[PDB]
Amino acid sequence: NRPNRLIVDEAINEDNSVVSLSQPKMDELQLFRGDTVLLKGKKRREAVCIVLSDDTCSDEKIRMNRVVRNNLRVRLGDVISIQPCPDVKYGKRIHVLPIDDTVEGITGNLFEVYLKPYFLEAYRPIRKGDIFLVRGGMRAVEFKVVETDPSPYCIVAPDTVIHCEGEPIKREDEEESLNEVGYDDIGGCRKQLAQIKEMVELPLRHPALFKAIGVKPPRGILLYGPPGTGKTLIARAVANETGAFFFLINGPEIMSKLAGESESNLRKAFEEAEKNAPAIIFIDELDAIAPKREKTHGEVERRIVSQLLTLMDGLKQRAHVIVMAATNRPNSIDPALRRFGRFDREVDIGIPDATGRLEILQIHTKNMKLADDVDLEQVANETHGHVGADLAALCSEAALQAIRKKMDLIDLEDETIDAEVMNSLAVTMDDFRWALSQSNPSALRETVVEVPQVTWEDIGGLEDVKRELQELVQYPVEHPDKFLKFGMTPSKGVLFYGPPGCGKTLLAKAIANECQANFISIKGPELLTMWFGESEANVREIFDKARQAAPCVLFFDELDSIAKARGGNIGNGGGAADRVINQILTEMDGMSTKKNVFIIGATNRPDIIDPAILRPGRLDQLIYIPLPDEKSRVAILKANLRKSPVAKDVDLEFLAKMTNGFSGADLTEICQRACKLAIRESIESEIVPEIRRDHFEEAMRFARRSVSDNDIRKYEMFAQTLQQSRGFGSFRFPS
Amino acid sequence: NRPNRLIVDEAINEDNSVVSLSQPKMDELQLFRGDTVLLKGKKRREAVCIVLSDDTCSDEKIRMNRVVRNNLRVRLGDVISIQPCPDVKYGKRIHVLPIDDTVEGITGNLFEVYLKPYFLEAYRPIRKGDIFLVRGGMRAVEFKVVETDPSPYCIVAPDTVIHCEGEPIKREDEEESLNEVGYDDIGGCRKQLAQIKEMVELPLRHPALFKAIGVKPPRGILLYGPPGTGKTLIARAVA
Ligand SMILES: Nc1ncnc2c1ncn2[C@@H]1O[C@H](COP(=O)(O)OP(=O)(O)O)[C@@H](O)[C@H]1O
Numbered sequence: 001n002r003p004n005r006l007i008v009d010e011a012i013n014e015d016n017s018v019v020s021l022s023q024p025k026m027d028e029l030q031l032f033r034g035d036t037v038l039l040k041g042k043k044r045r046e047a048v049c050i051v052l053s054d055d056t057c058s059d060e061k062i063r064m065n066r067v068v069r070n071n072l073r074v075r076l077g078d079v080i081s082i083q084p085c086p087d088v089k090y091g092k093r094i095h096v097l098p099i100d101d102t103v104e105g106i107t108g109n110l111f112e113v114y115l116k117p118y119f120l121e122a123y124r125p126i127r128k129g130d131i132f133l134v135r136g137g138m139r140a141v142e143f144k145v146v147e148t149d150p151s152p153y154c155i156v157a158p159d160t161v162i163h164c165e166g167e168p169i170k171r172e173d174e175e176e177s178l179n180e181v182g183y184d185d186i187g188g189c190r191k192q193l194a195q196i197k198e199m200v201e202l203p204l205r206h207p208a209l210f211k212a213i214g215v216k217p218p219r220g221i222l223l224y225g226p227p228g229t230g231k232t233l234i235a236r237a238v239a240n241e242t243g244a245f246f247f248l249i250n251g252p253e254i255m256s257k258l259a260g261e262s263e264s265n266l267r268k269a270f271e272e273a274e275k276n277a278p279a280i281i282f283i284d285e286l287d288a289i290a291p292k293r294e295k296t297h298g299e300v301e302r303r304i305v306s307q308l309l310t311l312m313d314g315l316k317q318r319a320h321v322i323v324m325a326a327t328n329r330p331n332s333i334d335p336a337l338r339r340f341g342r343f344d345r346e347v348d349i350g351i352p353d354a355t356g357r358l359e360i361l362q363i364h365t366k367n368m369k370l371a372d373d374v375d376l377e378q379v380a381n382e383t384h385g386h387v388g389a390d391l392a393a394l395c396s397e398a399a400l401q402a403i404r405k406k407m408d409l410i411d412l413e414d415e416t417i418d419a420e421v422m423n424s425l426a427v428t429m430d431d432f433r434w435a436l437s438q439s440n441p442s443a444l445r446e447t448v449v450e451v452p453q454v455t456w457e458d459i460g461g462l463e464d465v466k467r468e469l470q471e472l473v474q475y476p477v478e479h480p481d482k483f484l485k486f487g488m489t490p491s492k493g494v495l496f497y498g499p500p501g502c503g504k505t506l507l508a509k510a511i512a513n514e515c516q517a518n519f520i521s522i523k524g525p526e527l528l529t530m531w532f533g534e535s536e537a538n539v540r541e542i543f544d545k546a547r548q549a550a551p552c553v554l555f556f557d558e559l560d561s562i563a564k565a566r567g568g569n570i571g572n573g574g575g576a577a578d579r580v581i582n583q584i585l586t587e588m589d590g591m592s593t594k595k596n597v598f599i600i601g602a603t604n605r606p607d608i609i610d611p612a613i614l615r616p617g618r619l620d621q622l623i624y625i626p627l628p629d630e631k632s633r634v635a636i637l638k639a640n641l642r643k644s645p646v647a648k649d650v651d652l653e654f655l656a657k658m659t660n661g662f663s664g665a666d667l668t669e670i671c672q673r674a675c676k677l678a679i680r681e682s683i684e685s686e687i688v689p690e691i692r693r694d695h696f697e698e699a700m701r702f703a704r705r706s707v708s709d710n711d712i713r714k715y716e717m718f719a720q721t722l723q724q725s726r727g728f729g730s731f732r733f734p735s
Numbered sequence: 736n737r738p739n740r741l742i743v744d745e746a747i748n749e750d751n752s753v754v755s756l757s758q759p760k761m762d763e764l765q766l767f768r769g770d771t772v773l774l775k776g777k778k779r780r781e782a783v784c785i786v787l788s789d790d791t792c793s794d795e796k797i798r799m800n801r802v803v804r805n806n807l808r809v810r811l812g813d814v815i816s817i818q819p820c821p822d823v824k825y826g827k828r829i830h831v832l833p834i835d836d837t838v839e840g841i842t843g844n845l846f847e848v849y850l851k852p853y854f855l856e857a858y859r860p861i862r863k864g865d866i867f868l869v870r871g872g873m874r875a876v877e878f879k880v881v882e883t884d885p886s887p888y889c890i891v892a893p894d895t896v897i898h899c900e901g902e903p904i905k906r907e908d909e910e911e912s913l914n915e916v917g918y919d920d921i922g923g924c925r926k927q928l929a930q931i932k933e934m935v936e937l938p939l940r941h942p943a944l945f946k947a948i949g950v951k952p953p954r955g956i957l958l959y960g961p962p963g964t965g966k967t968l969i970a971r972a973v974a
Pocket residue numbers: 185186187188189226227228229230231232233360363387388389390392
């Protein structure tokens with residue numbers, strides 16, 4: 001038994017002496033809330049930390065940060081021994097000194113700038129011989145214990161004096177640098193990063209297991225994403241956290257060699273990593289190495305591609321090397337590389353969402369000190385087209401602005417800077433706004449994927465439609481047991497038709513938010529570009545991106561916008577079928593029905609929609625969104641007024657009754673006009689900060705009905721023709 | 736404190752001995768409109784100029800032209816020391832001669848063509864050892880002081896006689912050529928040029944600051960524009 005062995009895993013808190021344990025873990029080992037333990041690992045070394053309460057990690061695993069993982073020489077997946085230590089122990093004299101690998105540039109006091117704001121009111125239990133890292137001064141510097149009283153009996157106390165000599169010492173090869181790349185340095189990638197964690201955990205941490213079994217290990221991992229997403233960061237972090245010898249192979253570095261030298265350089269890079277097993281061979285750019293799809297210009301290019309292909313599939317076990325290649329675009333790769341044995345496991349790393357970029361900002365700003373009025377929530381929202389490298393550049397530029405506001409008048413003309421100035425240099429929002437306005441996003445044209453923040457509370461009315469949407473996309477994904485028993489497959493998608501500006505997009509986004517799945521949206525111009533550009537082959541890429549991002553919903557806005565541009569029911573001498581809808585149907589028919597992917601079709605002119613899409617099998621479920629009723633319009637305003645401060649004066653119920661033929665869009669622009677009037681009257685009166693009732697009274701003058709009465713009749717007759725519930729309404733069984 | 740340190744910046748006027756200062760800058764240092772100062776920089780050298788009134792530059796910076804920046808061996812972003820000099824000082828005999836790097840092609844009188852239309856009705860305070868540049872004759876030729884009365888006490892006066900030998904002298908590597916490319920030689924580019932000024936001011940003027948910090952410096956700047964816009968001019972001027 002020996003219930004003291006726990007699985008080491010990454011922590012969540014950014015502190016130093018923190019251990020995250022579940023309630024039953026301390027309840028089994030008679031451990032309390034505010035106690036200390038003694039973690040013991042390999043190489044005859046121990047560590048003293050503080051246990052904390054957790055409820056998310058696991059049942060029998062320990063969450064330990066990178067700062068303390070390097071102290072015990074224990075990586076992820078290894079096992080350690082934990083035991084309580086209720087013995088009283090105080091600190092008297094702690095002597096520490098940093099290592100010269102990171103102190104080059106520090107001048108002045110070292111206690112007041114790094115130790116005082118870290119050791120006081122913390123009661124961090126230090127251990128003689130441990131390496132702890134502290135952050136501050138827009139950098140990261142650690143410290144090393146060289147001589148102290150024999151451990152245990154080392155706990156920082158307010159009445160403990162600290163003195164240091166001043167010169168640093170050199171480190172050894174036993175410990176790794178804390179400034180390197182780790183799992184805690186990656187943000188905005190959780191679904192993709194977890195797959196890579198679980199994919200290479202066995203062959204790297206346990207190389208001897210695969211040598212004794214017939215299981216084929218994954219020999220190739222291809223990474224996607226626009227340049228700057230962080231593929232190299234993830235590749236280096238996996239190697240640095242799994243104990244594998246990382247070997248970086250740059251793209252242009254090999255191609256820059258002469259004729260025949262590139263072959264030797266690429267070939268010598270494989271057995272070198274094979275000897276240092278386990279190892280990970282990473283390729284920076286692979287589209288620039290093997291673009292053997294359309295280029296095929298030059299014998300040396302083909303020779304390099306063939307050499308790479310030969311060295312790729314020729315890894316018949318031997319070592320335990322895993323090759324992870326990175327590229328920019330999936331189609332820009334040689335198809336011969338995707339053969340089974342060279343590159344079979346495929347990983348697509350997308351642009352982080354709003355909740356992902358905040359983690360990147362927290363990672364990139366953890367070394368510097370910010371002011372109280374600095375919030376990263378608005379920065380992530382305002383930066384919705386940027387990538388991982390974009391935000392690091394934004395942070396660097398924002399940090400540079402603060403230096404410019406103090407270097408000019410202080411004029412520290414010294415060979416090295418002091419640590420007592422940079423700590424006080426707090427970056428404010430004004431520094432970030434200057435850099436945000438000039439940073440050009442590198443990721444704007446390709447489709448962005450989210451899991452939208454809009455929920456059911458933002459949608460007013462449409463209660464009949466909500467239950468229907470929560471009936472076909474949430475039941476097969478949560479309770480499939482009642483589906484395979486009947487032997488019938490679920491629906492492939494549902495089409496939305498009705499008057500424009502009623503919520504055709506809000507329902508699709510809310511159903512994605514509730515189901516916790518990705519959301520891909522295609523607008524009208526996006527569909528029209530591939531028609532006018534005479535290139536309909538881009539549907540396959542959209543469907544592939546949706547498939548491997550499962551679960552996800554495939555939303556097509558105004559699907560009839562391609563038939564409206566060429567007439568409609570009659571139009572020109574052609575019919576109601578074109579190349580883009582052709583390719584969409586072709587890719588939907590061959591789409592995997594067992595996957596969690598879903599397709600949402602939105603249209604405002606259902607009379608011109610091709611019937612070929614509407615058969616049972618592609619899009620059979622049709623839900624009509626009518627104009628909001630009296631109590632449906634009230635909820636629209638109750639949901640739209642949650643952002644702007646409006647007092648109790650404005651009567652929303654009375655406004656809904658007068659707005660009879662008003663769609664959802666008109667009620668939004670009414671509030672927009674009222675708030676614009678409020679802003680204008682505030683600015684004009686500045687030469688008050690609340691929305692009054694006469695604002696809406698004047699804004700109601702220009703209340704234009706976007707939907708007239710002529711199309712209402714057409715929509716209603718179309719709905720009743722497609723429903724056809726008459727005749728069989730009184731159909732009953734005799735006995 | 737020591738309120739005598741000012742930030743050196745480019746000037747606006749195309750004159751020679753002109754210092755642009757704000758009203759509070761002279762109001763703090765008890766300096767008037769028509770007075771002279773003594774600018775001191777690095778390498779144990781000084782410079783005498785005339786302060787002027789300005790209202791646009793800054794609160795605590797000094798605007799100094801390229802002609803006087805090379806005299807003190809001070810570039811943009813550096814700091815200097817300014818102090819008033821109300822002592823009376825007149826000129827008696829100023830001996831100057833140009834450098835052969837730019838005089839190849841000049842023949843005849845040198846005073847009437849370059850010094851007379853520059854020194855008269857100007858009262859420019861010269862300093863022994865300074866290199867001042869004058870424009871004229873569809874070119875630019877400067878002059879060098881080789882031997883004169885020990886500075887101070889060098890101010891051009893109408894009753895001051897000037898004679899010159901005629902042969903020039905060679906320059907050294909301490910000073911830079913005034914015919915080179917500078918910030919004053921770029922025109923029509925203010926928004927773009929300011930971004931490049933502020934982008935590389937830190938890593939170039941203070942190389943040791945980035946070596947002691949984790950901030951990533953900009954390693955690459957791409958320039959656009961149709962051929963002939965002046966990208967090479969800006970690139971050479973920044974360096
Ligand atoms: N998801 C991320 N989390 C944290 N940092 C990131 C992320 N993505 C990129 N970065 C930062 O951007 C910098 C540049 O990354 P880069 O080498 O361009 O990645 P790639 O090689 O995948 O394009 C790195 O130093 C890294 O710190």
